[PDB]
Each structure stands twice: as C-alpha cells, then as structure tokens.
Amino acid sequence: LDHPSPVIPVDPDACILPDAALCAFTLLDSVLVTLVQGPARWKMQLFEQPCPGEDPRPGGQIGEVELSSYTPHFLPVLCSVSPSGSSGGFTLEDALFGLLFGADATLLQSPVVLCGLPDGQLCCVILKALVTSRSAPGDPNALVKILHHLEEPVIFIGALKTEPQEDVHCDCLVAFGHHGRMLAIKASWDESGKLVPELREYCLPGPVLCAACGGGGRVYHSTPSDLCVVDLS
C-alpha cells in the first residue's frame, strides 16, 4: 500500500501464483486458502505464505482436495471460522465450534473453512487435516463435509453475537441464499441434557444482493428495492 496521472497500472512482476483457473480465495494468518475451478470437479488448495517480510510469495502447496459434490457467473465464497484460543475471519465460541466441527477440530484447535458454492450446498474442511502430497493424496469423502444443502446459490456466510448481554466470540452462524433463504444456527444443549443444533431456515423476501454483519446480531442485507435489516439479537 505504500507503493513508492493518479492511475498506476500493475506490471506482471506483481503476479503470484498465476493459476488462471482460481475462482475464489481467502486468507488466514500464515496460510492462503484458494479454490480453483478445474474441469467439472472443483478443487480446493491451500498454500503457505511466508510470515517474514520477504518477496511476497505463496510457497509450495501444502494440500489440495476435490469437492466431489460440485459438478457445474456466481463466484463461490469462503469463510474462516477459527476457534477461541487459536486473521481476517470469524472466531466462534467453543460450544458451537464443538457442535459443528466435532472433537477433531476442537482438539487440534484447527481453523475450519466453510465454502459456499454456487451449487448451494455449503461444505466445510478442516485445515490441520488437510495436508497431502503426491505420496499422500487428499481423500475427499473423508476430508470435506457438508453442513447444509440450501437449494439456491450462496451469497454470504457470517457469524453473530446474539445475547450481547474486535475478537468477539460469536455464537451464531448465518448463511444467505440468493433468493432469500437465510439460515441460522446456534447451540442449545436443551431438553435431554445434550448439545443440539438450532436450525432455522428463515425466508426473507427478494433476491438478496449482498450482506454484512453489524454489532449484535443485526444483519444488513440489500434486496433490489432497498437496504433492509434483520435482527437476531
């Protein structure tokens, strides 16, 4: 951003990993999870990213996978969901973390990556579990799993502090369809002395166009008519 007419064209010297088929990508602390359209089956990749201020490099690919469920305008979306105790993403709270990603993720204290795809279904992949090689190829049916099948494309995934009563230990999971199926999840531990998941498929109006998250369970979304707002708090 220092970067020693006010317009400045970029020279291809600045290009890093020109994979030229990559549809979406996100970042965590020291890692650069990307997601690249191959042929029919889309494949997630995972790179290093050198922590010291050097030539800004990717490094050599730690891992890949194949999102076997996806067989194709709408780019997919990625979200990091690290837990508390372990970053551009969202940190969940431990009870929820444990409900959704299980003991493995809890114990390794592993970030998790939620990919919503234009297909609709929204799959998660554990990073620590995603280390592979040419002698050790990443097994899809084991390594990538699928929370929920929205019927419709996916626009936004987030997390919210309901019960507010930067590092906020969110409690709520939000997904959002193009056509306006919102879906929220939260942890209960109700009724049997057992942890249970709270599903809600709400149904807002409209084609939704964008979404964000504001202090305390409010979700600013934008139908084609006007900037609307929803509260879960």
Instruction: Report DSSP state, residue 129.
Output: T
Which residue number, 81 or 219, has a Cβ lying nearer to another protein? 81
Question: 23, exposed or middle or buried, with CB in 10 Å at 0-12, 13-18, 19+?
Answer: middle
Cα distances (angstroms) measured from residue 78 to each of 2, 56, 111, 159, 188: 28, 22, 13, 13, 26
Question: 169, exposed or middle or buried, with CB in 10 Å at 0-12, 13-18, 19+?
Answer: middle
Per-residue contact flags (x/-) with another protein for residues 102 to 121, judged by CB under 8 A = xxxxxxxx------------
Q: What are phi and psi of 141, to 5 degrees?
A: -65, -25
C-alpha 32/C-alpha 27 separation (Å) is 5
CB of 196 to another protein, least distance (A): 8
CB of 152 to another protein, least distance (A): 22
Instruction: Report DSSP state, residue 103.
Output: H
Task: Based on the shown chain and the rule CB under 8 A, indicate whether residue 126 belongs to the binding site for another protein.
Answer: yes
Per-residue contact flags (x/-) with another protein for residues 141 to 180, judged by CB under 8 A = -xx-x-----------------------------------
Task: Based on the shown chain and the rule CB under 8 A, indicate whether residue 32 belongs to the binding site for another protein.
Answer: no
CB of 39 to another protein, least distance (A): 4
Burial 130-143 (b: 16+ CB within 10 A, else e): bebeeeeebebeeb
Per-residue contact flags (x/-) with another protein for residues 41 to 60, judged by CB under 8 A = -------x--x--------x
Task: Based on the shown chain and the rule CB under 8 A, indicate whether residue 188 belongs to the binding site for another protein.
Answer: no
Which residue in the set 6, 73, 134, 166 belongs to the binding site for another protein (CB under 8 A)?
134
User: Which residue ranges make up the site for another protein (CB under 8 A)?
Assistant: 12, 15-16, 18, 20-21, 30, 38-39, 48, 51, 60, 62-63, 86, 94-95, 97-109, 126-131, 133-137, 139, 142-143, 145, 189, 192-197
